[PDB]
């Protein structure tokens, strides 16, 4: 009644269905190579992932 | 002196038709609306509007029982149901017929208030 009407979205597609791993924000997820990262956090912490602007 | 004119299926033939011959009767936009079959989730409210479709009141202009489902279809079974189709402000009430049929309820409802320009 409340509990069944608490998670009643089909949560298998849409930018709202997925979520960020750092921030839990529903915009700008890097869905290339399954980084699944808010682009603002990717920028900061890509230095210690291995992504470096060599060119 | 001519009646409502459907494909080649009258209203008695429409009211009593199996739900797999009914699939080959209306447009593909309405075929795959009702090809998938039954529903287990909150879409058991269409079942509950089929259950509320048998709220045909006594001999009178029939009452308005509400539907907050604009994806609900103008089914030929429904014909004889004054309807409460919500559009964010006002529940519309347009009398239904064989002419309407094979279409969505939300069509005959204006979600956006009609636009008029000033200066």
């Amino acid at each position: 009644g409340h509990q069944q009407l608490y998670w009643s979205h089909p949560r298998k597609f849409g930018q709202g269905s997925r979520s960020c791993r750092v921030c839990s924000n529903r915009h700008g997820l890097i869905r290339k190579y399954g980084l699944n990262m808010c682009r603002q956090c990717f920028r900061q912490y890509a230095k210690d992932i291995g992504f470096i602007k060599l060119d | 002196f001519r009646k409502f004119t459907y494909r080649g299926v009258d209203l008695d033939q429409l009211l009593d038709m199996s739900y797999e011959q009914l699939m080959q009767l209306y447009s593909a936009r309405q075929r795959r609306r009702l090809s998938r079959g039954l529903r287990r989730k909150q879409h058991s409210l269409l079942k509950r509007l089929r259950k509320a479709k048998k709220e045909a009141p006594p001999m009178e202009k029939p009452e308005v029982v509400k539907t907050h489902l604009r994806d609900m279809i103008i089914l030929p079974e429904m014909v004889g149901s004054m309807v409460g189709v919500y559009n964010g402000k006002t529940f519309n009430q347009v009398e239904i017929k064989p002419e309407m049929i094979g279409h969505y309820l939300g069509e005959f409802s204006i979600t956006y208030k009609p636009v008029k320009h000033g200066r």
């Binding site: 990717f42 920028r43 602007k53 060119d55 | -």
Partner: protein, 100 residues
């Protein structure tokens, strides 16, 4: 008895070392050791806007993550190479040793 020692490195100084030091030392043990096979680069290109917001000009990043793969052909049972490998291990290269 084809051992197929997969050498995938982010760095060149270690991909040169791990491939060479498992041959340079494996010359003294006199086993029929081959040179390291090459695989082409995979430049994992993620091009992000520098700005967190949508204002200013559109200065794009070009985050280049190159990854390389080598493997060395052998005529050897497993234990002979295992005596050489785990001595002097460095963080760079992922050594996945194939038996078959």
């Amino acid at each position: 008895h084809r051992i197929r020692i997969t050498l995938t490195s982010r760095n060149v100084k270690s991909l040169e070392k791990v491939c060479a030091d498992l041959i340079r030392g494996a010359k003294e043990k006199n086993l029929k050791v081959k040179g390291p096979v090459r695989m082409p680069t995979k430049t994992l290109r993620i091009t992000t806007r520098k700005t967190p917001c949508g204002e200013g000009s559109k200065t794009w990043d070009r985050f280049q993550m190159r990854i390389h793969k080598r493997l060395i052909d052998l005529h050897s049972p497993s234990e002979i190479v295992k005596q050489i490998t785990s001595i002097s291990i460095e963080p760079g290269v992922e050594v996945e040793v194939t038996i078959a």
